[PDB]
Amino acid sequence: RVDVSLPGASLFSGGLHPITLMERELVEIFRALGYQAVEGPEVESEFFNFDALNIPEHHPARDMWDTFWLTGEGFRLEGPLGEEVEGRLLLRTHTSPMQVRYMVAHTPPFRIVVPGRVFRFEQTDATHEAVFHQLEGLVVGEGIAMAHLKGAIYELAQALFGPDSKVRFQPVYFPFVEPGAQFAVWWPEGGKWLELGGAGMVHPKVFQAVDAYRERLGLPPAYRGVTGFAFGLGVERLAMLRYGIPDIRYFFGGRLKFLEQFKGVL
Amino acid sequence: RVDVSLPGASLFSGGLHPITLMERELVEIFRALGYQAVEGPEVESEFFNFDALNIPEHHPARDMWDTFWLTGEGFRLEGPLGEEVEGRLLLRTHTSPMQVRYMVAHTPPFRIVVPGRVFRFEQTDATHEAVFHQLEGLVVGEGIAMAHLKGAIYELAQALFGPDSKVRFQPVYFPFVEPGAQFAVWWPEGGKWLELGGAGMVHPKVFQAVDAYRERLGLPPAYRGVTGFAFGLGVERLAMLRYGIPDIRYFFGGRLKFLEQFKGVL
Ligand SMILES: N[C@@H](Cc1ccc(Cl)cc1)C(=O)O
Numbered sequence: 001r002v003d004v005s006l007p008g009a010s011l012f013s014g015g016l017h018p019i020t021l022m023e024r025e026l027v028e029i030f031r032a033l034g035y036q037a038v039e040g041p042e043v044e045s046e047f048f049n050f051d052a053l054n055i056p057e058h059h060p061a062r063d064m065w066d067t068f069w070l071t072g073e074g075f076r077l078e079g080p081l082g083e084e085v086e087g088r089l090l091l092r093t094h095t096s097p098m099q100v101r102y103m104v105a106h107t108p109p110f111r112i113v114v115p116g117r118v119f120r121f122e123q124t125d126a127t128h129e130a131v132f133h134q135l136e137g138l139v140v141g142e143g144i145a146m147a148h149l150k151g152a153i154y155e156l157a158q159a160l161f162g163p164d165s166k167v168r169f170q171p172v173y174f175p176f177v178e179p180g181a182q183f184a185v186w187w188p189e190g191g192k193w194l195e196l197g198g199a200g201m202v203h204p205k206v207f208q209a210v211d212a213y214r215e216r217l218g219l220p221p222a223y224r225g226v227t228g229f230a231f232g233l234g235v236e237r238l239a240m241l242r243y244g245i246p247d248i249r250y251f252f253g254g255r256l257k258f259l260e261q262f263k264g265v266l
Numbered sequence: 267r268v269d270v271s272l273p274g275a276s277l278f279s280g281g282l283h284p285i286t287l288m289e290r291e292l293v294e295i296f297r298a299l300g301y302q303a304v305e306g307p308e309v310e311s312e313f314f315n316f317d318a319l320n321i322p323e324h325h326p327a328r329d330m331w332d333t334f335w336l337t338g339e340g341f342r343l344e345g346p347l348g349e350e351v352e353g354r355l356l357l358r359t360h361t362s363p364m365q366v367r368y369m370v371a372h373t374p375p376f377r378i379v380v381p382g383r384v385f386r387f388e389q390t391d392a393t394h395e396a397v398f399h400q401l402e403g404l405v406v407g408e409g410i411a412m413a414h415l416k417g418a419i420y421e422l423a424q425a426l427f428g429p430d431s432k433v434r435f436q437p438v439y440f441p442f443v444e445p446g447a448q449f450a451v452w453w454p455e456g457g458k459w460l461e462l463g464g465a466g467m468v469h470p471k472v473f474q475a476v477d478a479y480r481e482r483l484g485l486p487p488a489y490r491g492v493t494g495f496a497f498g499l500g501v502e503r504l505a506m507l508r509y510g511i512p513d514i515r516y517f518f519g520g521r522l523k524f525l526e527q528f529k530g531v532l
Pocket residue numbers: 093094095096134136174176177197198199200201229230231232233
């Protein structure tokens with residue numbers, strides 16, 4: 001005889017962070033489309049974070065990213081081909097620099113998605129962080145057109161919001177793409193357009209930067225006769241909409257009563 | 267003071283079965299190519315396992331599968347659209363019947379991969395089982411050609427054996443495909459051609475079977491103007507080659523000293 005309705009050994013039950021779940025789902029969505037996930041370093045060179053992406057200093061466009069500038073020596077920032085690069089250190093303001101690193105280290109055609117923690121000097125409120133996550137996308141190859149960028153996002157939406165979802169593209173500006181664009185997806189439930197991220201056809205100058213850096217490293221040009229599209233989307237804003245989180249500050253808050261709430265989710 | 271090199275609480279450490287790992291890897295390989303995994307029932311109707319696939323009785327081709335015939339009443343075998351079908355019960359001799367079930371329940375274009383336990387009345391030796399696993403593939407859609415079947419397998423190989431791998435196709439016979447084929451992949455390490463599975467362009471009569479069954483269920487024809495390819499490969503033979511298992515009988519042997527050996531693997 002035993003009271004079988006009696007509690008059992010208190011073995012701990014784990015869980016994954018909301019961002020991990022969201023990032024995972026996103027990565028799966030694109031894996032099904034032939035994209036592979038790779039990461040980049042959080043501490044970057046001004047060259048990779050800005051210059052290589054067609055974003056020079058004193059440029060009005062560089063104001064789109066409030067940079068955290070770093071200092072200190074003894075630190076070894078390593079480049080794409082493992083080599084020891086230089087440049088003013090800073091915390092990457094977006095995952096974009098990674099599409100330059102990847103391109104100098106591989107050859108087209110290819111599909112990549114790169115998730116990552118990004119940093120920006122900004123005031124932390126209920127829907128704004130200085131430390132958040134993005135998910136970049138980059139598909140390069142001969143004959144790649146903007147019709148493909150639009151199809152990718154269409155697929156992203158369907159996968160994220162169902163058959164009654166739909167995408168919308170509006171021209172927007174980014175120094176690393178041309179044509180450039182911002183896209184929104186239709187959220188049937190909340191019944192409204194969510195501005196998800198920006199995108200566009202990789203910029204001529206970005207390809208040139210890649211090949212120039214390649215030469216300097218002894219590699220042969222690989223992006224002379226190919227085109228490609230890239231995109232980037234904020235993760236928290238989407239995780240919040242999706243998991244119904246009211247305050248973006250929770251993610252990095254570390255509160256268990258909060259985190260524990262996502263054990264179930266997948 | 268504590269002897270920190272002293273054993274800790276003996277919390278149990280789990281593990282996954284070799285077939286699960288192999289099946290998983292296979293499913294991932296194809297997910298990246300846009301395939302989605304679905305399953306079918308182990309107990310089947312002669313109609314789905316044979317007739318629907320262009321394999322009639324007393325046919326010399328039906329001898330390619332030694333069937334386990336079942337008996338007993340009260341059992342409810344459910345069809346594709348959840349309805350209660352009939353026919354002589356048997357243990358499926360391959361996963362193929364599932365490509366008929368899926369097709370009457372959905373519309374093209376699409377990509378599916380269906381893993382599954384199959385049964386065949388055969389003598390169990392070191393490299394032969396009566397109970398094993400297959401992985402079917404079926405890609406239907408307007409304009410689908412044999413050039414695509416060949417590309418899929420090419421991708422399968424690369425993903426399974428590296429850049430120095432290569433595929434080979436030879437004409438072979440199957441009542442449910444035409445052209446029909448058998449394919450082998452080059453295994454650089456062991457340096458030899460491994461005959462992996464059969465494939466081919468879905469047979470006209472299979473599409474007709476699907477649409478006929480659809481009508482009988484009130485659904486409209488969906489496979490009149492589309493073509494498609496399918497393939498099927500034995501899982502154990504591949505898991506063995508891959509994990510270096512000497513005896514196929516181990517998988518269903520249930521021996522822990524055996525299973526425990528795969529905890530690490532992924
Ligand atoms: N990473 C950019 C978003 C982006 C725009 C365009 C492209 Cl093509 C890719 C990403 C940002 O931080 O605003």
